[PDB]
Design a binder for this molecule. Structure first.
Ligand SMILES: O=S(=O)(Oc1ccc(-n2cncn2)cc1)[C@@H]1C[C@@H]2O[C@H]1C(c1ccc(O)cc1)=C2c1ccc(O)cc1
Ligand SMILES: O=S(=O)(Oc1ccc(-n2cncn2)cc1)[C@@H]1C[C@@H]2O[C@H]1C(c1ccc(O)cc1)=C2c1ccc(O)cc1
Lengths: 237, 236
C-alpha cells in the first residue's frame, strides 16, 4: 500500500472516515420467550452475530488502509478479528447499562441468563468487566472507532506487514490528537493510550475463549450455523 | 500507600533489572519425540519456580493479597515464559533459544501436534522485537505489565476494587517509565507514543500465543509435575 490516501489523512479526517464507516445497531429479529434454553440463547446470539458479520464486512472496506491489502490479507484479518470486533461493539454499547450486556436494544442480558449455556457466565463476566472499565475511563465514541480499527489491522498481523504497521502508527497519532484536543497533559495521553491498548489484550483473551466455546457448540450440534459462521470457525481450527 | 508509586523512572528500571531471574540451562538428557515435551516441561517447571521469586520483586506485586498474586501468576505464567523466550531468541533468526544449551527451529515443533503454529508465532514475535531493536529496559517493563495486566479483569468485593486500582496506578507508572526510556534514547514525542503502542499491541499477540498454548497444554494431559497440573486447573 505505498502512496495510500490512508497514510496522508489528518487525525480529524481519519475519525470522520471511521465514523462514516460505522455499522448500524441491529435489533434481534426475535424476542425470546422466557426463560432461555441453551438452544434458544445460542439461536438468538448466532442469528444476531451472522447479521452483524454482514455489516462488519461493509465496515471493514471503509476502514482506511484495509482495502489497500490483497483480498487474501483482508480475508485473514477479518477471519482473525471478527469476534474481537463483535465483542468491542458489545462492550461499547453496554457502557450505559451497568451489570448488563446490550446485545441489541431488545436483547439486554445480565450475567444470570448466561447460566443456561456451559462456560457463558465466565465470558459474560469478562465482557461486563470490560464494559465497566470503559465506563470508568469514560471512553469516547472517537476513541472507540480508533480501537475497533486497531483490532481489525492488528489481530492477524503475525510491504503489506509494514503497510499495516504504518496505518496502526497513523491510528496511534489519531488517538493522541483526540486526547490532546480533550485537554489531557502529555503524561495523561501516554497513560490513557496504554490503558486502552492493554484492554485490547483482554478483548483478544475473551475472543480466544469465545472461539473455543463456539467450536464446542459446533460439535454439540445445538444450533444450525450459517456457512459464513462455519467458514470463520474452520479458519481458527 | 505502595512504595512502587514513589519510584522514579530510573528506580523502576533498576528494581526490574535487579529482579531478573537467573538464566537456566536445560538439565534433561538428550529418543526424540515424550522427550520434546519432557525437555520443555522440565525447563518450564524450573523457570516457574524462579518466576515466583521474580514476581515478589516486581514493584507493586507484594502489596497484593496472596489470592491476587496467585490469580495473577496463574493467568500470566505462560505469557511470561513466552516473552522471555522471544527476548532471548532475538539474535537467533529462525530459532527459539529455550536455553543457552537448547536452540530449536520450527522443524523441531513437527515432533508434536499444533506446536509448529505456536513456534511460527513465537519466531515472528522475536523478529518484530529484533526489527524494533527492543532494549533490555523495555523488555523488563513489558514483562511486568503482563504480570499485573493479564489477570486484572478476572479477579468482586471492596478489597478487590482497591487491588484493581493499585494495579492500574502501577501500570501507569510502568507506562511513564517506558516513555522516559524512549525520550532518554532521543525519540520524538510522536515516535515515543508510536513505539509505546507497537510494544503494547505485541502483548495482545503474546496473550493469543498463551491462549493457544494452554489449549494444547490442557489436551496434552488428555509427564507433568503437580505444579504444572495445578497451573492447568486455573485455565480449565
Ligand atoms: O463466549 S460466548 O458467550 O459464546 C459461547 C459460550 C458457550 C457456548 N457453548 C455452547 N454449547 C456449549 N458451550 C457457546 C458460545 C461469545 C461472546 C458473545 O457471547 C458469544 C457470542 C456469540 C458469537 C457468535 C455466535 O454465533 C454466538 C454467540 C457473543 C457475541 C458478542 C457480541 C455480539 O455482537 C454478538 C455475539
Ligand atoms: O504453546 S506451547 O507450544 O505449548 C504446547 C504446544 C503443543 C503441545 N502439544 C502436546 N501434544 C500435542 N500438542 C503442548 C504444549 C508452549 C510455548 C513453548 O512450547 C510450549 C512450552 C511449554 C511450556 C510449558 C510446558 O509445561 C510445556 C511446554 C513452551 C515454552 C516457552 C517458553 C519457555 O521459556 C519454556 C517453554
Amino acid at each position: 500500500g505505498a502512496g495510500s490516501l490512508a497514510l496522508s489523512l489528518t487525525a480529524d479526517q481519519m475519525v470522520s472516515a471511521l465514523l462514516d464507516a460505522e455499522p448500524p445497531i441491529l435489533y434481534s429479529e426475535y424476542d425470546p420467550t422466557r426463560p432461555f434454553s441453551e438452544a434458544s440463547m445460542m439461536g438468538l446470539l448466532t442469528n444476531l452475530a451472522d447479521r452483524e458479520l454482514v455489516h462488519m464486512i461493509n465496515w471493514a472496506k471503509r476502514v482506511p488502509g484495509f482495502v489497500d491489502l490483497t483480498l487474501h490479507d483482508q480475508v485473514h484479518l477479518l477471519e482473525c478479528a471478527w469476534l474481537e470486533i463483535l465483542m468491542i461493539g458489545l462492550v461499547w454499547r453496554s457502557m450505559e447499562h451497568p451489570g448488563k450486556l446490550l446485545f441489541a436494544p431488545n436483547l439486554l442480558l445480565d450475567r444470570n441468563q448466561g447460566k443456561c449455556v456451559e462456560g457463558m457466565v465466565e465470558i459474560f463476566d469478562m465482557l461486563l468487566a470490560t464494559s465497566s472499565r470503559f465506563r470508568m475511563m469514560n471512553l469516547q465514541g472517537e476513541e472507540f472507532v480508533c480501537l475497533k480499527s486497531i483490532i481489525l489491522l492488528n489481530s492477524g498481523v503475525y510491504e503489506e506487514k509494514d503497510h499495516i504497521h504504518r496505518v496502526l502508527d497513523k491510528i496511534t497519532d489519531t488517538l493522541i490528537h483526540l486526547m490532546a484536543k480533550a485537554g489531557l497533559t502529555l503524561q495523561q495521553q501516554h497513560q490513557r493510550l496504554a490503558q486502552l491498548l492493554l484492554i485490547l489484550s483482554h478483548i483478544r483473551h475473551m475472543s480466544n475463549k469465545g472461539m473455543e466455546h463456539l467450536y464446542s457448540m459446533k460439535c454439540k450440534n445445538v444450533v444450525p450455523l450459517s456457512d459464513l459462521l462455519l467458514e470463520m470457525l474452520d479458519a481458527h481450527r
